[PDB]
Amino acid sequence: KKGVVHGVATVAEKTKEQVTNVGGAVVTGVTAVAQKTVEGAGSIAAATGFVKKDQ
Amino acid sequence: KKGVVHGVATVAEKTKEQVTNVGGAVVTGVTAVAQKTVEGAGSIAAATGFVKKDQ
Amino acid sequence: KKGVVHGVATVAEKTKEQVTNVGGAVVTGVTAVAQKTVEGAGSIAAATGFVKKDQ
Amino acid sequence: KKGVVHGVATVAEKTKEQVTNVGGAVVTGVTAVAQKTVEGAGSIAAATGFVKKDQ
Amino acid sequence: KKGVVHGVATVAEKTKEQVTNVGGAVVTGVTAVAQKTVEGAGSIAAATGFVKKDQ
Amino acid sequence: KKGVVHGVATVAEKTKEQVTNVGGAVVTGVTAVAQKTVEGAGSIAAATGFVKKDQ
């Protein structure tokens, strides 16, 4: 076989899960957050997949 | 076989899970956060996959 | 076989899990955080995969 | 002070939390379950407070 | 002071948490279960407070 | 002071936590279980407070 990509690719066979991202956010997984009190200014209290930027 | 990529690629066969990211965030995994009190200014209380930038 | 990449690639066969990242964050694994009190300014209380930058 | 109980009592002062049970079940706490696949016959997959009886 | 109990009592002062149980189950605490696959017949996969009886 | 109990009592002053149990199960503490695969018939894979009986 032959393949040429520029990116971002994701090429496969017999594949149970696939995610391609440029971004941005993708949430495909099981996630449970139980929480009782959030205070403070400002605290990231429960982050799973996270980025921050400033310019 | 033959392959030429520029990136970012992810090329495979018979593959159960795949993630390609440029970004950005991707959450595909099981995650449980149980939490009772978050205070303070400002504290990253429970971070799983995390980045920070400032300019 | 033949392959030429610029990066970042991830090339394989018969492969159960794959992650490619430029970023950014990717969370694909099982993660359990149980927590009772977070205070202080500012304390990274439970970080699994983490980066920090400042300019 | 004076107190006479038959049970089950729970007597206090200045008290943040209280539970009295005869039973039975009481759930008052933070709880997060994230789960992806349960099989088998029959498996108690994630039990926090649990009892079993048979006669 | 004076106290006479038959049981089950729980008598106190200045007390942050209290549980009285005859039973039965009481869950008051922070609990996080993250789980990906449960199989088998039959396996108690993640038990925190647990009893079993048979007659 | 004077006290007479039959049991089960738990008598105190200035006390941060209290548990009385006849049972039965009580879960009041922080607990995190992260788990990826459970198999077999039948294996107690992660037990914190546990009993078993048979007659």
Structural domain spans, chain E: 1-46
| CA atoms of B16 and B12, how far apart (whole Å) | 10
Give the three-state DSSP class for A20. strand
Select the residue from D27, D30, D48 to test the A interface by mutation, using most A Cβ atoms within 10 A: D30
| CA atoms of D2 and A35, how far apart (whole Å) | 40
E6 assigned to a ligand binding site = yes
**String of b and e for F14-48 (b: at least 16 CB within 10 Å)?**
ebeebbbbbbbbbbbbbbbbbbeebbeebebbbbe
Q: Is the dihedral of CA B20, B34, A32, C41 positive or negative?
A: negative
**Helix (H) / strand (E) containing B24:** none
Residue whose entry in the numeric block shows the structure tokens 């925190």: E48
Q: Is there a contact between D3 and D11 (Cβ–Cβ < 8 Å)? A: yes
Q: Is there a contact between A49 and C19 (Cβ–Cβ < 8 Å)? A: no
Q: Which residues of B touch C28 (CB under 8 A)?
A: 17, 19, 26-29
Kindly state the tokens that stand for F18.
């209290």
Rg, Å, chain C Cα set: 18
| CA atoms of B17 and F25, how far apart (whole Å) | 39
Q: Is the dihedral of CA D17, D23, D27, D33 positive or negative?
A: positive
Distances, alpha carbon B2 to alpha carbons A14, A46, B6, B7, B13, in Å: 19, 44, 14, 15, 14
- Give Cα A12 to chain centroid, integer Å: 20
- Give Cα A25 to chain centroid, integer Å: 5
The residues facing A6 across adjacent strands are: none
The residues facing F26 across adjacent strands are: E26
Q: Do chains A and F touch (3 or more CB pairs under 8 A)?
A: no
Residue C34 is nearest to which of E32, E35, E36, comparing CB atoms? E32
| CA atoms of F42 and C47, how far apart (whole Å) | 34
| CA atoms of C3 and B35, how far apart (whole Å) | 48
Kindly state the tokens that stand for E8.
């089950």
Q: Which residues contact D18 (CB under 8 A, 6 or more apart)?
A: D10, D12, E18
β-pairing verdict for F47-49 and F31-34: unpaired
Kindly state the tokens that stand for B5.
């990529």
How distant is the Cα of A14 from the closest Cα of chain B, in angstroms?
5
